[PDB]
């Protein structure tokens with residue numbers, strides 16, 4: 240067919256890197272009357288984005304036509320898919336015209352298409368480089384109306400543009416957004432927040448009289464750990480890099496941070512999403528069978544990721560480390576409940592006979608579920624800990640794609656409250672590291688003192704740095 244030739248020839252044009260040939264083949268198809276489908280359009284947008292814009296004379300027809308091709312795709316009502324948005328975005332990034340990036344997003348919306356987060360990036364980061372705060376806030380308002388949630392890079396851009404234009408109101412609001420959506424901040428956002436609090440504008444914003452009643456009312460109302468009523472106090476901020484002790488006490492100022500509740504209704508929603516997500520990947524009958532088993536067992540104070548407890552920091556599966564963990568979890572259980580061990584059936588059948596007999600004893604005591612061949616254990620230990628409302632014992636770093644499906648609002652908060660990690664020393668052996676008695680999140684106290692935590696990969700490996708910003 241003629242459409243299958245365009246497909247065949249554009250495939251090679253990208254793989255060569257010839258944009259001029261892809262643009263010739265584009266026009267030939269219009270002069271031949273051949274309709275372009277999803278696939279054809281995506282390859283052109285990608286191919287066009289291999290071009291750069293000229294430092295000397297007007298930009299090259301690869302990028303210029305790229306946007307025209309995109310505009311035409313939308314006009315034609317060719318359905319965009321995830322490769323469309325990626326390509327249109329990398330076209331916008333190479334072009335580096337924030338104004339034109341923002342047009343694509345406006346077209347998408349005009350034609351009933353839901354823009355992606357990566358669509359907004361070129362516009363937002365361009366306007367930020369340029370210092371055009373008003374345009375950045377336009378892009379932001381457009382995301383909000385499109386219900387596309389920013390992540391940390393977009394929020395940091397918004398923060399920095401707000402700092403650049405002395406807009407203390409936007410700094411405040413953006414800081415609350417970081418609290419709400421990100422919780423702990425990257426190193427570059429952390430440095431940026433420190434600069435804000437040390438700056439003249441920050442020194443010069445505030446109020447020395449305020450209604451203590453309305454603040455306290457706002458603290459109750461927000462769920463705790465913030466009030467949202469604006470900057471309080473006056474004068475220079477004391478801004479110190481510091482740490483929290485194990486009880487959430489700031490080492491600089493002695494403020495004890497608060498522990499923020501989780502709403503049990505959000506937990507039930509999450510439980511249902513786990514079930515849905517798991518059923519999509521596991522054999523449905525396997526996950527059902529586990530849920531039915533779980534309904535007939537328990538109660539549990541803890542759930543163990545048995546593969547991770549056998550393997551973390553080991554050359555091969557350590558039954559010693561699994562068993563030591565089981566024993567320690569049982570010892571801290573107020574009634575000495577055995578923890579529920581989730582482990583692959585292949586690993587249940589350990590080749591030292593007393594260990595195999597113990598694994599079978601645990602099963603017989605209602606405290607071991609052997610997951611079937613082909614299963615991903617993670618769904619099982621997550622579903623169990625969530626549903627049994629108990630501790631989850633795993634050092635899984637949660638780098639896997641699976642965990643990205645769980646979202647970045649509820650699940651990180653839940654994890655903080657439920658996750659136990661093991662650590663081992665030469666001197667002392669194995670230790671359980673329990674959930675902290677405070678929430679590791681940006682906090683704003685009732686007198687307007689701020690504590691801002693840095694994000695780290697593992698906070699047992701890394702001593703987590705915090706900012707303490709307190710009026711002098």
Ligand SMILES: O=C1C=CC(=O)c2c(O)cccc21
Pocket residue numbers: 364365366367368369370396399400
């Ligand atoms: O000042 C900047 C504001 C936003 C932004 O994205 C940016 C950047 O990406 C590189 C240098 C400076 C800035």
Ligand SMILES: O=C1C=CC(=O)c2c(O)cccc21
Pocket residue numbers: 514515517518519523526527530
């Ligand atoms: O949609 C489902 C996927 C898995 C699963 O176990 C399940 C279930 O157990 C009950 C209703 C729906 C589902």
Ligand SMILES: O=C1C=CC(=O)c2c(O)cccc21
Pocket residue numbers: 498499655656657674675676677678
């Ligand atoms: O006292 C606690 C405050 C917060 C919190 O998350 C917590 C916890 O997760 C386990 C025991 C005590 C606390």
Ligand SMILES: [Cl-]
Pocket residue numbers: 591592593594
């Ligand atoms: Cl033995």
Ligand SMILES: [Zn+2]
Pocket residue numbers: 489490491492493494690707708709
């Ligand atoms: Zn402090």
